[PDB]
Ligand binder design. Structure first.
Ligand code: CL
Length: 187
């Protein structure tokens, strides 16, 4: 079960950005990729507090820090959406919303240890999609892995419609677009 995500490049992944449902969280009139970019921008000042940690975690895991930032923006609005680190049902923990029912949580909610745990979980989902669909373009495997972070690898059943069944019907599309935006902010 070797890992092999070292060729993946977030800049090559196609995206249609946020759905209307997702855009409404900031009452945006923007749509799609534009909306994702604005959602990300709204989280930038908070994200920048964590940028040094996010960068270190990405480097330590061979993953683009911008992807980690995209996940954090989507999962927790860089902490703004959380109550002492917890999601609304006390199950999701931390900037990346690790599910305490699936994992033994580690670190404070805003810690490097936490960000490493969420990042490892994402990296494992990427590995699984590479295993499940070994002939796919790596861009599609990366996008599918991101979708699986929200919906599980079991939700990735076909090449088409990957974000069907994800929260908002747009999880990987939105995360990819936010990640690209953070990359252009120097993540
Ligand atoms: Cl929750």
């Amino acid at each position: 079960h070797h890992h092999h995500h070292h060729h993946m490049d977030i800049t090559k992944v196609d995206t249609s950005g946020a759905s209307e449902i997702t855009a409404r969280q900031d009452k945006l009139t923007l749509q799609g990729v534009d909306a994702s970019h604005k959602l990300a921008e709204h989280d930038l000042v908070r994200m920048n507090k964590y940028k040094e940690l996010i960068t270190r975690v990405g480097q330590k895991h061979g993953l683009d820090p911008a992807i980690i930032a995209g996940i954090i923006s989507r999962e927790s609005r860089a902490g703004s959406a959380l109550d002492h680190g917890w999601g609304d049902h006390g199950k999701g923990f931390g900037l990346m919303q690790v599910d305490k029912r699936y994992h033994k949580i580690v670190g404070a909610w805003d810690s490097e240890k936490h960000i490493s745990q969420g990042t490892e979980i994402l990296i494992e989902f990427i590995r699984r999609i590479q295993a499940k669909f070994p002939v796919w373009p790596k861009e599609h495997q990366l996008k599918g892995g991101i979708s699986a972070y929200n919906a599980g690898d079991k939700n990735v059943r076909t090449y088409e419609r990957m974000d069907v069944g994800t929260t908002g019907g747009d999880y990987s599309n939105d995360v990819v677009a936010r990640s690209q935006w953070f990359k252009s902010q120097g993540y």
